């Protein structure tokens, strides 16, 4: 009748965009980088072990100053570490012990938290009283919070388990914009360096690029076969990598609107949990479920050194703003700070 021809038109359009992507791919990125010198073996040492948590760590986020990191754990405590000296600057007690994400504001004044309570609480560190209290409990999500990031001190874009990402206004408390179009639970987002764009990975094995001001999905890069456990941006903002649960990482391109390279190897069969990029973008660090954290060259797809000493699943990962250090937080309540040296 009417829905049948509409679905036929949709299938024809999908075929059209697929063949356009195939035609615009004259070659692949693997052959182009067959002459560039390899990054070689990379060794990273456990410079610090931010012990103090009493339960599994589920997220972390580096501050703008590349010194303070906030971590969230099932103990219900939002701890802000001084990674230079391993000092616990703040120990924020969460209202709900179940937290799946946290964030550090670019200004450093506010930190975020959220989880199974579907509330993306925001705490104000810099207060006259001297302690830390929740400022605005953002509510309105139907599902659990997955990963929430702040565009500015008033605008925060979030991701829930209700197939919809949202952009919030801290001052008012209502969703300025609501992002819809995903048919599965969304697990993580990744803000662009220039803040104009942001992508999100969902449970339908599809990563969609959205616009903060447009309010609608722009591109729906789709090459994965399983849920994207986390997404991340290239330093220049022209590409991103989507992690996934089928033990492979894919580096998509914004302009090409297609997969550029696939990161996988036979002996790894554990899905990627977190993904982050180095400052130069050459090294793609991913936190796997086999207690390791592999470091792949983003232009070669060869494993270059692993940060194997963590004893449990790496649940979170983060690279500093200046790229000086890489921090991973596992389920054994240990945050380890790493960097490269000879």
């Amino acid at each position, epitope marked *: 009748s009417e829905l049948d021809q509409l679905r036929q038109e949709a299938e024809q359009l999908k075929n059209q965009i697929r063949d356009a992507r195939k035609a615009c791919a004259d070659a692949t990125l693997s052959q182009i980088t067959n002459n560039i010198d390899p990054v070689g073996r990379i060794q990273m040492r456990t410079r610090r072990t931010l012990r103090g948590h009493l339960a599994k760590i589920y997220a972390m986020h580096w501050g703008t100053d590349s010194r303070l990191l906030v971590s969230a754990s099932q103990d219900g405590k939002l701890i802000i570490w001084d990674s230079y000296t391993t000092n616990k600057v703040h120990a924020i007690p969460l209202r709900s012990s179940w937290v799946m994400t946290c964030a550090y504001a670019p200004s450093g004044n506010y930190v975020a938290c959220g989880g199974l309570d579907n509330i993306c609480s925001i705490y104000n560190l810099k207060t006259r009283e*001297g302690n830390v209290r929740v400022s605005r409990e953002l509510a309105g999500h139907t599902g659990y919070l997955s990963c929430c990031r702040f565009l500015d001190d008033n605008q925060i874009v979030t991701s829930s388990g209700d197939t919809t990402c949202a952009l919030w206004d801290i001052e008012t408390g209502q969703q300025t914009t609501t992002f819809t179009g995903h048919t599965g639970d969304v697990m993580s987002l990744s803000l662009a360096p220039d803040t104009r764009l942001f992508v999100s990975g969902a449970c339908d094995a599809s990563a969609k690029l959205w616009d903060v001001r447009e309010g609608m999905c722009r591109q729906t890069f789709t090459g994965h076969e399983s849920d994207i456990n986390a997404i991340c941006f290239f330093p220049n903002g022209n590409a991103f990598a989507t992690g996934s649960d089928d033990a492979t990482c894919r580096l998509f391109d914004l302009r090409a609107d297609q997969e550029l390279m696939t990161y996988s190897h036979d002996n790894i069969i554990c899905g990627i949990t977190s993904v982050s990029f180095s400052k130069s973008g050459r090294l793609l660090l991913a936190g796997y479920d086999d207690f390791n954290c592999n470091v792949w060259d983003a232009l070669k797809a060869d494993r270059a050194g692993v940060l194997a000493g963590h004893d449990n699943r790496v649940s979170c990962l983060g690279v500093t703003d200046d790229g000086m250090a890489v921090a991973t937080g596992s389920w054994d309540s240990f945050l380890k700070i790493w960097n490269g040296s000879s």
Partner: single-chain antibody
Amino acid sequence: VQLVESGGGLVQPGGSRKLSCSASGFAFSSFGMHWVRQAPEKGLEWVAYISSGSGTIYYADTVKGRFTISRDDPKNTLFLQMTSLRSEDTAMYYCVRSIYYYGSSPFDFWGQGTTLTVSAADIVMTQATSSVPVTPGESVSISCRSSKSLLHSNGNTYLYWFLQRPGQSPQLLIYRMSNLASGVPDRFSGSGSGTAFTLTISRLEAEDVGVYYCMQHLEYPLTFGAGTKLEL
């Protein structure tokens, strides 16, 4: 936030007293407390400091073995015990709050203070000028000098600049020579090179008047500056 102190009066030398500092409007238990005295027509002088949770205790060498500072968390009141008084101990004693962590602003708030009238190595801090005639609308530079370089290996040089309004408790202006304290106008600016310490005021207004005190915070005992006074 507010700090109220009581226990002032005329006391014969060699007696005993009790100075009580009441804390209200903030989390007392998480704030370290200092006690600062100010001899009449003289500069401020450190007395004692007690850490958060009574963990660690410091006293000045002048009053060591005689004066003791004690916090009480459940009643939200700090207490300075007082005994073996002498004619040099008559001063305006201030209760001072300070919280210590990365990026914190210690010495941010000062209590009103009580008047005490008694009847009848360490870093030496020097300021070249004691009275600077000035008119509003210009720029003023205050010179502070230290016996030893305050810059540390961590990269932090511990400066603390204070403004004491006439008949008012001193107010924190700049900490670590570069971070502007909350509630302070943007016109104030500071700089330093490890030996030459300066404070700059971009433009002058009636409120800019006051005695300026520069601090070192590398190590205890705490020491105050000579005291640069601004007058119109």
